[PDB]
Amino acid sequence: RVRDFVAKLANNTHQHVFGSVSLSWVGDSTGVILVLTTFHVPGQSKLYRSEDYGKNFKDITDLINNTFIRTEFGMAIGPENSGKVVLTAEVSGGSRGGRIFRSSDFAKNFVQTDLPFHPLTQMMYSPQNSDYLLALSTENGLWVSKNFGGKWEEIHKAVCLAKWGSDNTIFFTTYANGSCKADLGALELWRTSDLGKSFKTIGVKIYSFGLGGRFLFASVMADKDTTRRIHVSTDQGDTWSMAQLPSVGQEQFYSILAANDDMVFMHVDEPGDTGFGTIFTSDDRGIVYSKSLDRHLYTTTGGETDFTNVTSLRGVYITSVLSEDNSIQTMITFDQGGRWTHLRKPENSECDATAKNKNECSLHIHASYSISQKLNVPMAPLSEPNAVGIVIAHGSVGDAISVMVPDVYISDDGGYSWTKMLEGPHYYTILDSGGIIVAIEHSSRPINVIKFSTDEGQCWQTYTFTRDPIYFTGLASEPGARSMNISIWGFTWVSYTIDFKDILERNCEEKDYTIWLAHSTDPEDYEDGCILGYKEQFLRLRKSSMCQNGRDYVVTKQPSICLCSLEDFLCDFGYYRPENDSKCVEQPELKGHDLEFCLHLTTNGYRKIPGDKCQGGVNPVREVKDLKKKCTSNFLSPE
Numbered sequence: 145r146v147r148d149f150v151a152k153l154a155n156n157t158h159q160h161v162f163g164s165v166s167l168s169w170v171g172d173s174t175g176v177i178l179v180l181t182t183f184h185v186p187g188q189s190k191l192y193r194s195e196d197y198g199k200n201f202k203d204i205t206d207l208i209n210n211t212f213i214r215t216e217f218g219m220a221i222g223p224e225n226s227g228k229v230v231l232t233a234e235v236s237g238g239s240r241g242g243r244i245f246r247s248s249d250f251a252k253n254f255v256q257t258d259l260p261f262h263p264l265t266q267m268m269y270s271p272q273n274s275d276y277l278l279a280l281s282t283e284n285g286l287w288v289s290k291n292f293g294g295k296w297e298e299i300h301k302a303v304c305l306a307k308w309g310s311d312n313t314i315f316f317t318t319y320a321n322g323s324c325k326a327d328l329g330a331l332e333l334w335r336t337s338d339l340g341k342s343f344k345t346i347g348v349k350i351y352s353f354g355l356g357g358r359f360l361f362a363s364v365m366a367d368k369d370t371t372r373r374i375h376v377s378t379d380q381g382d383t384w385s386m387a388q389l390p391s392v393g394q395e396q397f398y399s400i401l402a403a404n405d406d407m408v409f410m411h412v413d414e415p416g417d418t419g420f421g422t423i424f425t426s427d428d429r430g431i432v433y434s435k436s437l438d439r440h441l442y443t444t445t446g447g448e449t450d451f452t453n454v455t456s457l458r459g460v461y462i463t464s465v466l467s468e469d470n471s472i473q474t475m476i477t478f479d480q481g482g483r484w485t486h487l488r489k490p491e492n493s494e495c496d497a498t499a500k501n502k503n504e505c506s507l508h509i510h511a512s513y514s515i516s517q518k519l520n521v522p523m524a525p526l527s528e529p530n531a532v533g534i535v536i537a538h539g540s541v542g543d544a545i546s547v548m549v550p551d552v553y554i555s556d557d558g559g560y561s562w563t564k565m566l567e568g569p570h571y572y573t574i575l576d577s578g579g580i581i582v583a584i585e586h587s588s589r590p591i592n593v594i595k596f597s598t599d600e601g602q603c604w605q606t607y608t609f610t611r612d613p614i615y616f617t618g619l620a621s622e623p624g625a626r627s628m629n630i631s632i633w634g635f636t637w638v639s640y641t642i643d644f645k646d647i648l649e650r651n652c653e654e655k656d657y658t659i660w661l662a663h664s665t666d667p668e669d670y671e672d673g674c675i676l677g678y679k680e681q682f683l684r685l686r687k688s689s690m691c692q693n694g695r696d697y698v699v700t701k702q703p704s705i706c707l708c709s710l711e712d713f714l715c716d717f718g719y720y721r722p723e724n725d726s727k728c729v730e731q732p733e734l735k736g737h738d739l740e741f742c743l744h745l746t747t748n749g750y751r752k753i754p755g756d757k758c759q760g761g762v763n764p765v766r767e768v769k770d771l772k773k774k775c776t777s778n779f780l781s782p783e
């Protein structure tokens with residue numbers, strides 16, 4: 145519903161003409177884009193650079209000296225504004241050392257450097273400092289560089305896996321003899337804070353390790369069995385604590401679904417080839433775990449899962465579960481995994497063939513699992529933190545995820561309500577923190593048009609961006625959903641970057657924004673909107689208003705602190721919540737893995753949900769008590 149839109153886009157539209165193809169953005173608010181193509185012909189690499197968000201590209205294959213670049217390593221991009229770019233070149237079969245090309249000037253100038261080893265993994269930038277780097281050689285050697293790749297010293301041999309921690313710390317696992325596969329479950333976990341000068345052994349009998357938020361996790365194998373269990377440390381391995389999670393076997397796996405400063409979402413595989421597991425939410429120490437969701441779909445250790453952080457609203461997560469019927473259903477939690485429920489269906493929607501009742505059903509979302517089964521899904525769900533409460537996803541309306549070709553649904557309130565956005569599979573992108581949505585029909589045949597909306601998917605305009613139809617491949621836009629430049633890629637290889645600057649000529653002002661209470665279920669109630677003990681009220685751009693938010697737009701929100709209630713605490717170890725009300729109570733006797741933990745000790749009977757900011761009201765935390773005597777009450781033990 146924008147007048148004379150065609151005129152504005154026509155001048156703004158820009159076109160550029162150009163094996164294995166990869167595109168990497170460099171920095172924020174720089175517009176630097178690198179495109180790398182390699183082809184194997186019985187074979188040279190091509191590199192392009194753009195400083196205008198992809199409107200124009202300049203060939204810079206001269207800087208790489210026509211050297212072949214290995215696709216597997218890809219293009220290593222430096223942290224935020226470092227501008228560092230590293231490409232791993234291919235070298236002669238007999239070369240003693242590897243060769244890489246590096247740049248620190250956002251790829252304007254590249255310097256060739258030979259290496260003392262052959263890289264086995266991609267070089268990883270240290271988060272605290274861009275200059276520091278680490279890599280693993282073909283001989284499982286760990287090399288570190290303090291000069292952005294000029295000089296590499298082998299700090300330690302036989303490293304199975306290495307990762308960057310906070311403050312330039314390095315954690316790695318080593319194998320005493322043979323190969324990592326031989327020493328599975330017998331590895332040693334080491335840490336060095338001095339860039340290899342000094343080493344500290346923080347674990348033995350290690351299977352693997354992981355990092356999430358503050359937490360550092362390590363899986364340790366039993367002495368008398370194959371089974372392994374998780375141990376957690378918040379002090380970089382100086383002290384360790386067992387995690388109240390079940391032990392698993394070699395067939396089973398552990399996966400960190402999501403982690404942050406407050407807590408972690410942990411997935412434990414069920415015994416057998418079920419293809420599903422249970423989700424556990426931790427406390428602020430990562431030690432005590434609450435069962436959140438049953439029969440959560442996860443194919444294998446590196447397999448597909450539909451678990452999705454809805455990044456546009458606090459505490460909202462979406463995933464898929466396998467019912468006993470062997471049908472897949474989509475579940476959503478609005479309170480960080482405290483309760484899970486079915487997504488509400490759009491009001492003007494018809495239940496499909498999967499529904500028992502024609503007028504009652506739910507909305508189900510197509511994510512990574514649907515894509516892996518070769519369903520007609522071109523994109524997983526999309527959400528951005530800048531665009532408050534907006535979720536866009538492919539889905540079906542019924543009792544379960546259906547095989548039929550899907551339509552696109554949008555939510556403007558963080559997942560509480562939905563409406564059909566477009567018919568049939570599409571590609572979508574969010575721009576200007578929600579100021580514009582852009583969409584691209586997915587078809588077998590070429591396309592010549594791009595669709596855009598300025599009222600959060602409620603209405604759309606159709607604009608033709610080319611004379612000649614192209615075969616659509618993908619969309620590229622600056623990470624962070626703050627630019628107004630979108631790029632359409634396809635072959636007849638071409639790329640039309642549209643700029644929407646003219647469409648939103650007017651910048652936004654106070655009057656454009658309006659007040660919106662997030663998480664509002666019942667507007668009359670004092671407690672309405674309390675999630676994790678507090679409410680958030682937002683200023684968001686009115687749907688009718690069509691103005692640019694700007695690159696420096698700031699989400700404005702004010703927090704209201706609710707009164708603590710029992711619902712803001714979870715049961716500590718040794719307590720459970722009966723089906724009756726919600727007061728935590730001490731279990732008759734611990735069983736299963738709960739008994740394993742016994743043989744954190746002090747239990748308050750209640751602990752505050754991590755991330756919960758409620759103040760005042762009830763405090764149910766009890767004086768610290770010890771259940772060890774209760775635990776060993778049944779065991780005869782020596783004097």
Ligand SMILES: *[C@@H]1O[C@H](CO)[C@@H](O[C@@H]2O[C@H](CO)[C@@H](O)[C@H](O)[C@H]2NC(C)=O)[C@H](O)[C@H]1NC(C)=O
Pocket residue numbers: 402403404405407408409453454455456529
């Ligand atoms: C789910 O996504 C949200 C949004 O990205 C995450 O919230 C961010 O967390 C980081 C790290 O704690 C903070 O620096 C940001 O300020 C948060 N963003 C907002 C908008 O609050 C959240 O941590 C994710 N959930 C999990 C479990 O990782």
Ligand SMILES: *[C@@H]1O[C@H](CO)[C@@H](O[C@@H]2O[C@H](CO)[C@@H](O)[C@H](O)[C@H]2NC(C)=O)[C@H](O)[C@H]1NC(C)=O
Pocket residue numbers: 175195196197199626627628629643695
């Ligand atoms: C879309 O891309 C253009 C470049 O083609 C961006 O233009 C830049 O704008 C900033 C500030 O407006 C200037 O400091 C830069 O010098 C501009 N670059 C060029 C190459 O002209 C434009 O900002 C992008 N749109 C958005 C919303 O970020």
Ligand SMILES: CC(C)CCN1CC(=O)N=N1
Pocket residue numbers: 351352353354361362363374396397398399400
């Ligand atoms: C949670 C952390 C120990 C991940 C390492 N992994 C994978 C697995 O399944 N066992 N250890």
